[PDB]
Structures are given as C-alpha cells and as structure tokens.
Amino acid sequence: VNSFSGYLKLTDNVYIKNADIVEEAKKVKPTVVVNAANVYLKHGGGVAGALNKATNNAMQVESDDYIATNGPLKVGGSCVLSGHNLAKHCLHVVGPNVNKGEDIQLLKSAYENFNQHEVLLAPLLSAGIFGADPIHSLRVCVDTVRTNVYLAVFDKNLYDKLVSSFL
Ligand SMILES: Fc1ccc2c(c1)[nH]c1ncnc(N[C@@H]3CCOC3)c12
Ligand SMILES: [Cl-]
Numbered sequence: 001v002n003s004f005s006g007y008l009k010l011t012d013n014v015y016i017k018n019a020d021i022v023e024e025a026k027k028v029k030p031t032v033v034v035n036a037a038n039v040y041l042k043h044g045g046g047v048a049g050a051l052n053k054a055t056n057n058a059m060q061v062e063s064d065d066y067i068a069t070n071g072p073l074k075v076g077g078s079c080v081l082s083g084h085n086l087a088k089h090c091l092h093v094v095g096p097n098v099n100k101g102e103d104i105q106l107l108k109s110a111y112e113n114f115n116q117h118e119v120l121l122a123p124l125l126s127a128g129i130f131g132a133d134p135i136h137s138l139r140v141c142v143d144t145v146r147t148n149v150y151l152a153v154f155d156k157n158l159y160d161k162l163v164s165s166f167l
Contacts, residue, residue: 003028004150010166014142014149018159021123021152022054025086033083034122037092039072046129055084075102076109098131111144119148138162
C-alpha cells in the first residue's frame with residue numbers, strides 16, 4: 001500500500017492521473033520523482049522548468065555542479081539527484097527531443113531507467129515540449145517499465161485521450 005490517490009489503473013504496474021506533477025510531488029513526497037531532463041540538466045521549461053521553479057532554483061544549482069563534475073548525460077540516460085522539497089530523490093531522465101532530431105527509438109532506453117526504482121512518480125517521457133506523441137510514450141512506458149509507475153498528465157484533454165485510446 002502506498003499514498004498515491006485518485007489514479008486510474010492501466011496495467012499491473014502502471015497508473016495514470018490528470019495532475020500537476022509539481023503539486024502531486026508536494027503532496028505525496030514520493031521516494032522518486034522523475035524529471036523530463038535534457039543532457040545539460042538545464043531546467044528551463046516544460047516539466048523540468050516547473051519542478052526546478054518549485055525548488056526555488058535549488059535543483060538547477062545542484063544540477064550545474066553535477067554537470068561541471070561529470071559532463072552531460074546521454075540521450076536515453078539518467079542520473080539520481082536530490083528531490084529537494086518535492087521528493088527524496090529526483091531521477092533526471094533524458095528522453096529524445098523530437099524537436100532536436102533525436103531518435104525516437106531512444107524512448108525505450110529512457111524508460112528502462114525507471115526499472116532501477118521500485119516506485120516512481122513520473123511524467124510521460126518525450127511528451128510536451130519534447131515533441132513526441134504522448135500516446136506512443138504511454139505505450140512504450142507500459143511495455144518497458146516493470147516497476148510501479150504513477151504517471152501525472154497535466155493536460156486534462158490529453159489525459160482523457162490517453163485513457164480512452166489505451167489498449
Ligand atoms: F509548467 C509546467 C509545464 C509542464 C508540465 C507541468 C508544469 N507539470 C506537468 N506535470 C505532468 N506532466 C507535464 N508534461 C506533459 C505536457 C502535456 O501533458 C503532460 C507537466
Ligand atoms: Cl511539457
């Protein structure tokens with residue numbers, strides 16, 4: 001039993017809700033919140049901009065030190081950093097950005113990072129400003145993630161479309 005409330009169950013391990021991931025993280029304080037990161041951990045907009053803003057820029061400060069030490073992530077890769085006031089940990093995961101020409105096949109690799117954590121609160125990778133089809137992202141999530149994932153979808157119209165079209 002966990003504290004996630006109001007989710008629709010899609011499969012044995014995948015759950016979905018129309019919610020603002022920032023507000024969901026602040027309420028649940030999950031062990032892991034997933035950020036829709038880029039390789040530079042520059043949290044300017046989309047989910048990343050919103051999560052970072054909610055940490056009063058502490059996420060960005062920590063991220064800049066991480067990059068200065070380690071260099072950029074790989075597309076499809078991830079790193080674990082602090083969750084600040086939102087979660088115990090933040091798993092920064094880089095899905096391919098279609099608006100940069102990146103291979104959509106890398107979306108499966110990106111979701112594989114979730115399997116290193118038993119339970120996660122997450123957005124749909126590569127959705128929103130990353131330019132991929134969210135219906136496809138949900139399909140890859142369900143077919144790749146085996147651990148327990150709670151998906152927060154900000155847009156109500158999109159949430160209803162994802163549920164109604166789910167096979
Ligand atoms: F300021 C922002 C900007 C983007 C998001 C945000 C707050 N909170 C989010 N929570 C979950 N998923 C998100 N990204 C996808 C976009 C379409 O539906 C889901 C966002
Ligand atoms: Cl977005």
